[PDB]
A paper describes a structure:
Here, the current status of the fully automated ambient-temperature beamline VMXi at Diamond Light Source is described, and a highly efficient pipeline from protein sample to final multi-crystal data analysis and structure determination is shown. The VMXi beamline and its associated PXF within the Research Complex at Harwell offer a highly automated pipeline where researchers provide a suitable protein sample that is used for robotic crystallization, monitoring and subsequent in situ data collection from crystals in crystallization plates or in thin-film sample delivery systems. Here we present illustrative examples of data measured using VMXi from a variety of proteins comprising both conventional crystallographic standards and ‘real world’ user samples. Routine RT data collection provides a useful capability that is highly relevant to studying protein dynamics and ligand binding without the complication of cryo-cooling.
For AbD08, a bovine naïve ultralong antibody (i.e. arising from a sorted B cell originating from an animal receiving only a typical course of veterinary vaccines), sparse matrix screening yielded >10 crystallization hits, and the VMXi screening capability was useful to provide fast feedback on diffraction and crystal quality without the user having to go through the lengthy and challenging process of harvesting many crystals. In this case, we were able to rapidly identify promising conditions and collect a complete dataset to 2.2 Å resolution with 96% completeness from four crystals [see Fig. 2(b) and Table 2]. As done previously, a cryo-structure was also collected (in this case at beamline I04 at Diamond Light Source) that yielded a 1.59 Å dataset. MR placed one monomer in the ASU and full structural solution was possible thereafter, despite a 3.5% difference in lattice volume. In the cryogenic structure, an extensive network of hydrogen bonds involving both protein and water molecules was resolved surrounding this loop (and the greater Fab monomer). The significance of these differences between the two structures is not immediately clear in this case, but may be a consequence of an inherent difference in stability of this loop at both temperatures, thus hinting as a potential link to its biological role.
Author numbering:
A (entry chain H): 28 to 144, 151 to 160, 165 to 269, 275 to 296, 298
B (entry chain L): 30 to 244
Write the structure that this text describes.
């Protein structure tokens, strides 16, 4: 399979710049999907931003309306979100999503809707060849919203802080126990800013036995994290830091 | 968060647990309530729409109901996998405007204890060429998610320049943490051994490295 959603855009934006994200939708059986945007700030709940439906109608969180803009290019199955004059409070994980949005006709108790006698009435009873015979009332309108499929999320930091590219050091546990049946290899991703980094091994050929640990904020004011793999073959850790446009593929000597 | 949920719920493996979601006549009271599951290091997943309908590929252990302004999510046969944050949601005043609950962290009790696996890395040659030496102590597959890390050089306890992460839940509901000891290269080379000592539920795993065998 069904729809897959990929957010793309910058991981770092300065205060009072415009934040622009793209959502790419692939694998829908359908010509077009209603697409919405949700964010989660660290240690807060989910917050609705807005959506654009298959007719190009936009709806926004009325708190953020004056700051938000959602456009679509159906030629490239893309939806975009612009958020103007961002501050550090706009730091969050941004998700795009497919949304279901529908208005239902709501009839009071003991009243039928539909054309299964009557068709020309919202809510009716025959308590009947023509509509004037039935006992009727006007519908109320109930609003239905829900997210069908979620994206992966994109981490956005709003900060004046400078970027620092990581230094990548190769790690071996070997000298701990040189007769060990297995060897544990790793990479130290040292002194970077901001989050995130992505770490793979052998360009994603080596997935099983991989453990990437959460970043620590060190006393330097910079992040570090480590990734390790246990193996009983060259070994390379692939480290991407999107904020600095840097990739490092580090050779790790295995004992 | 606008809709009210308990911040915490606990149940034991195989038992039943319920999460409530309270709003007003203008959101939850209209129905078409939805529920979302967020397992950490992961994208949210839709569980329930239209008060009671399970989403595609959600198991029948998950069920929901609404009574006026209060929606309830019920998880039967609790598994370790069900540890997550759960959120309810509703349209508010239009189908393109939505409010979320404050979120509930579900804890699943009666999981088996799991001692940490500990790996201690010495400093890389490349780092030592810069007169810095970072010792890295990697701690994984422990339950529950509480460890204390002590570093030793030649029987001395080291407290200066130690940075230990919080424990974070892996996807398998066990925990990981890391400790970093930042030295100069002189400090590294001037000692017979450095040790990472990890205590978990009164038990201690110690790994040791010797500069003499690692440089």
């Amino acid at each position: 399979a069904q729809v897959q959603l990929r957010e793309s855009g910058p991981s770092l934006v300065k205060p009072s710049q415009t934040l622009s994200l793209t959502c790419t939708a692939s694998g829908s059986s359908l010509s077009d999907e209603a697409v919405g945007w949700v964010r989660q700030a660290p240690g807060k709940s989910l917050e609705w931003l807005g959506s654009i439906d298959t007719g190009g109608n936009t709806g926004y969180n009325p708190n953020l309306k004056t700051r938000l803009s959602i456009t679509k290019d159906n030629s490239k199955s893309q939806v975009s979100l612009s958020m103007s004059s961002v501050t550090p409070e706009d730091s969050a994980t941004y998700f795009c999503a497919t949304v279901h949005q529908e208005t239902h006709q709501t009839c009071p108790d003991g009243y039928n809707s539909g054309d299964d006698c009557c068709g020309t009435l919202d809510c009716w009873r025959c308590d009947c060849r023509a509509s004037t015979d039935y006992r009727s009332v006007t519908a109320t309108y109930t609003y239905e919203w829900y997210i069908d499929t979620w994206g992966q999320g994109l981490l956005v930091t709003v900060s004046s802080a400078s970027t620092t590219a990581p230094k990548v050091y190769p790690l071996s546990s070997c000298c701990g126990d040189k007769s060990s049946s297995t060897v544990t290899l790793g990479c130290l991703v040292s002194s970077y800013m901001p989050e995130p980094v992505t770490v793979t091994w052998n360009s994603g050929a080596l997935k099983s036995g991989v453990h990437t640990f959460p970043a620590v904020l060190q006393s330097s004011g910079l992040y570090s994290l480590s990734s390790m793999v246990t193996v009983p073959q060259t070994f390379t850790c692939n480290v991407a830091h999107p904020a600095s446009s840097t990739k490092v593929d580090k050779a790790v000597d295995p004992c | 968060g606008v809709l009210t949920q308990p911040s915490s719920v606990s149940g034991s493996l195989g038992q039943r647990v319920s999460i409530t979601c309270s709003g007003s006549s203008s959101n939850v009271g209209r129905g078409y309530v939805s529920w979302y599951q967020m397992t950490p290091g992961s994208a949210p997943r839709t569980l329930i729409y239209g008060d009671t309908n399970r989403a595609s590929g959600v198991p029948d252990r998950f069920s929901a109901s609404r009574s006026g302004n209060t929606a309830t999510l019920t998880i039967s046969s609790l598994q370790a996998e069900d540890e997550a944050d759960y959120f309810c949601a509703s349209a508010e005043g239009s189908s393109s405007n939505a409010v979320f609950g404050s979120g509930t962290t579900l804890t699943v009790l009666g999981q088996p204890k799991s001692p940490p696996s500990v790996t201690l890395f010495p400093p890389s040659t490349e780092e030592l060429n810069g007169n810095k030496a970072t010792l890295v102590c990697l701690i994984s597959d422990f339950y529950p998610g509480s460890v204390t890390v002590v570093w030793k050089a030649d029987g001395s306890t080291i407290t200066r320049n130690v940075e230990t992460t919080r424990a974070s839940k892996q996807s398998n509901s066990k925990y990981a943490a890391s400790s970093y000891l930042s030295l100069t290269s002189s400090d590294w080379k001037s000692k017979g051994s450095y040790s990472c000592e990890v205590t978990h539920e009164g038990s201690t795993v110690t790994k040791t490295v010797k500069p003499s065998e690692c440089s």
